[PDB]
Amino acid sequence: SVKTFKKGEVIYKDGDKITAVYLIQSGGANQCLIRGKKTIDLFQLGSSHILGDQVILGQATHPTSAVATTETKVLEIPVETLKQQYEGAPQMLKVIIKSLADRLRLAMNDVRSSKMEKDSSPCPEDQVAKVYGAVFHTANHKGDRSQAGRVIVDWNMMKQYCQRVMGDSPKRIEQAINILVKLKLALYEMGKGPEEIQKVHFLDLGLVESFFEFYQYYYFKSDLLKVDELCMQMLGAILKLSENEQPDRFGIVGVDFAKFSEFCKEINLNNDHFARLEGKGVFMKRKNAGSGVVLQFEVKEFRSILQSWKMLREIEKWNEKGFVDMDE
Amino acid sequence: SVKTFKKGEVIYKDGDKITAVYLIQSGGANQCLIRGKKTIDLFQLGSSHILGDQVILGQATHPTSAVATTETKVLEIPVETLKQQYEGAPQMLKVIIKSLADRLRLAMNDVRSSKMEKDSSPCPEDQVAKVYGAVFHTANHKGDRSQAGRVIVDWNMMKQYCQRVMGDSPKRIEQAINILVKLKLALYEMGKDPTGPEEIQKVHFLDLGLVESFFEFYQYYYFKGGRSDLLKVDELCMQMLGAILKLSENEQPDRFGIVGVDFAKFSEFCKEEIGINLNNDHFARLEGKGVFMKRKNAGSGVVLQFEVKEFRSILQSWKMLREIEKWNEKGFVDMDEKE
Numbered sequence: 001s002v003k004t005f006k007k008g009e010v011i012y013k014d015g016d017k018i019t020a021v022y023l024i025q026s027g028g029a030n031q032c033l034i035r036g037k038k039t040i041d042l043f044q045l046g047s048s049h050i051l052g053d054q055v056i057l058g059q060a061t062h063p064t065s066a067v068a069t070t071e072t073k074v075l076e077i078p079v080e081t082l083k084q085q086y087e088g089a090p091q092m093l094k095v096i097i098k099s100l101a102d103r104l105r106l107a108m109n110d111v112r113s114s115k116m117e118k119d120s121s122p123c124p125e126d127q128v129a130k131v132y133g134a135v136f137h138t139a140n141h142k143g144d145r146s147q148a149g150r151v152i153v154d155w156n157m158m159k160q161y162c163q164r165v166m167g168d169s170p171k172r173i174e175q176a177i178n179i180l181v182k183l184k185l186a187l188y189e190m191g192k193g194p195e196e197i198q199k200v201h202f203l204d205l206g207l208v209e210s211f212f213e214f215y216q217y218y219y220f221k222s223d224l225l226k227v228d229e230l231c232m233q234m235l236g237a238i239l240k241l242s243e244n245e246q247p248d249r250f251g252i253v254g255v256d257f258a259k260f261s262e263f264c265k266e267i268n269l270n271n272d273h274f275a276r277l278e279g280k281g282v283f284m285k286r287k288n289a290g291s292g293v294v295l296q297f298e299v300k301e302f303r304s305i306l307q308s309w310k311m312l313r314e315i316e317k318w319n320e321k322g323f324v325d326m327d328e
Numbered sequence: 329s330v331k332t333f334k335k336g337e338v339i340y341k342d343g344d345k346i347t348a349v350y351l352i353q354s355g356g357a358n359q360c361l362i363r364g365k366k367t368i369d370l371f372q373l374g375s376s377h378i379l380g381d382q383v384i385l386g387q388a389t390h391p392t393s394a395v396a397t398t399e400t401k402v403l404e405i406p407v408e409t410l411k412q413q414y415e416g417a418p419q420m421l422k423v424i425i426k427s428l429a430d431r432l433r434l435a436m437n438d439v440r441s442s443k444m445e446k447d448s449s450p451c452p453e454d455q456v457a458k459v460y461g462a463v464f465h466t467a468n469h470k471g472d473r474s475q476a477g478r479v480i481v482d483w484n485m486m487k488q489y490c491q492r493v494m495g496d497s498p499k500r501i502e503q504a505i506n507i508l509v510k511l512k513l514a515l516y517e518m519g520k521d522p523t524g525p526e527e528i529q530k531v532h533f534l535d536l537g538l539v540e541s542f543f544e545f546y547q548y549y550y551f552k553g554g555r556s557d558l559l560k561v562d563e564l565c566m567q568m569l570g571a572i573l574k575l576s577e578n579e580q581p582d583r584f585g586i587v588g589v590d591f592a593k594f595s596e597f598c599k600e601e602i603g604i605n606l607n608n609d610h611f612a613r614l615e616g617k618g619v620f621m622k623r624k625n626a627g628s629g630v631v632l633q634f635e636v637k638e639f640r641s642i643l644q645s646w647k648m649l650r651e652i653e654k655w656n657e658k659g660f661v662d663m664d665e666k667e
Contacts, residue, residue, distance in 0.1 A: 049427045050427045085418065085421065086421070092351075092409075092410060093414065093425075096381045097425060098376070099376065099381070100432055104432040107432060108435055111435055111439060111442075114438075115442070129492050129493055137469070141468075164461075164547040165543060166461065219492075
């Protein structure tokens with residue numbers, strides 16, 4: 001009997017009685033604590049690991065939760081089989097196994113109590129700039145640059161550098177670069193029984209530097225770093241509307257109020273939506289022409305603002321959930 | 329046979345080959361890392377635990393030292409007894425043990441890792457390469473290069489970019505740059521704020537290459553493994569390296585960078601200047617610190633080949649390590665020490 005779990009499926013929840021013992025034959029199980037919508041990662045166990053062996057200690061309940069990180073095939077072992085095979089082991093191996101499991105228990109205890117002792121959140125407000133900063137400088141100093149504008153960095157050669165020289169968890173680093181690839185700002189070269197990432201391609205570091213400079217500028221001194229979904233929806237709606245208009249000499253593209261008002265209804269535009277938009281950074285140069293009022297603006301400004309807003313939105317998605325989902 | 333240790337006795341030291349395996353029948357044994365005066369307590373095991381069970385998975389050297397915390401009685405078990413008892417065990421028990429011990433290693437590393445975050449010392453070890461990697465990069469990416477040979481950085485901009493993008497307390501950054509200034513590798517442009525005791529306005533980095541060399545050295549030797557004594561700057565080794573780099577100062581290197589020094593002159597100006605006869609033991613020390621040399625019998629005698637760049641960078645990094653130790657002790661960097 002082998003059990004096949006799909007990616008993201010719950011193998012067992014914290015508190016459930018151990019009905020069988022799973023030997024991971026392929027894939028990966030994330031031992032964690034599913035906490036409402038947040039999922040605090042504990043450990044990642046690949047093949048030849050045993051889940052639910054706590055029954056050796058006489059335990060009846062799973063201490064942690066486990067989630068499949070990939071299609072995970074495990075071998076189902078009857079609990080009493082493992083029980084009677086441990087009870088019938090030579091005395092010294094019994095002592096060694098009890099000691100090992102007991103110490104692992106204790107270590108699991110401090111781990112859970114520590115991971116929750118501090119860091120109330122994945123990506124704290126005081127680490128956004130810092131984190132990406134790390135990424136940037138790493139790719140800016142140790143990356144292959146002889147290509148058409150993309151910077152290639154060995155995955156391990158970054159998991160090292162960002163953790164030793166920059167002081168950043170490789171998990172948070174991977175999640176930030178995951179946000180980058182989800183916004184088609186970066187790419188993942190993969191390969192290598194198992195399949196792992198070998199390199200990472202950064203299409204554009206400039207945007208990364210712009211983002212962390214902007215975040216560190218507003219955060220260390222806000223009403224702009226709170227991304228309002230309505231304002232983003234409006235910014236993205238007007239950006240598409242102004243996509244065809246001719247860029248001016250100074251680069252000011254206007255939009256007739258008629259089409260805009262209609263689009264917004266796609267609720268009812270008034271000056272309060274304008275004011276809510278103002279506090280988010282985007283300013284509208286209102287002008288009067290024969291066609292009525294036209295909302296002139298610079299595209300070099302509004303495009304960058306929408307980008308940084310998408311960045312902040314993905315960071316909020318990272319904080320609310322605990323990780324970055326790239327399937328949607 | 330049962331061995332009875334008194335409170336304080338060392339059951340074994342780290343690095344010692346496991347010759348025996350002790351089953352704690354009573355008492356307790358603290359597992360730690362004895363390094364001179366500093367003692368890093370890791371984990372404590374009482375009765376019904378086996379010390380030395382790591383030999384199953386092929387450790388063959390003790391990962392940590394073990395000291396008895398009270399009167400402790402242990403049963404001595406031969407290593408080959410346990411190894412043969414394990415190799416003849418069912419494969420199910422083997423995979424159970426392997427998975428258990430690997431998961432225990434993972435959780436132990438997660439505990440030791442999150443404990444070093446609580447370090448309150450001025451410049452923790454695991455932070456050294458982070459502090460300079462932060463200083464260097466900032467000065468390398470925001471510094472004004474108008475004056476040749478040096479990189480000028482505004483002081484407030486330096487502090488802010490280190491705190492907000494590199495995540496470093498401005499006090500620690502200031503003390504690291506103090507170490508830099510003290511070693512003639514940086515300067516401090518003094519201005520008068522609107523308030524006259526003067527005030528740091530800008531910092532001049534005379535040599536960022538040395539900074540990168542040092543933090544690469546440190547990141548490469550700190551995260552290596554259990555052998556973390558390569559960072560202990562040995563006064564005996566530093567004196568000898570300074571002596572040999574003072575000797576080989578008028579030699580021209582070829583495309584590899586190597587220069588020579590008469591083994592004669594080296595030993596003679598080593599005994600008559602320091603006070604020791606050069607022998608094979610001293611070189612066993614500088615070899616374990618990172619100082620390797622090529623001996624070749626050609627012409628006048630045995631000549632010692634080494635690239636001056638590597639040895640001078642190691643000497644500067646040794647200065648750095650000694651200053652970091654002084655900083656950790658005093659709490660600041662006395663820029664007027666003057667050894």
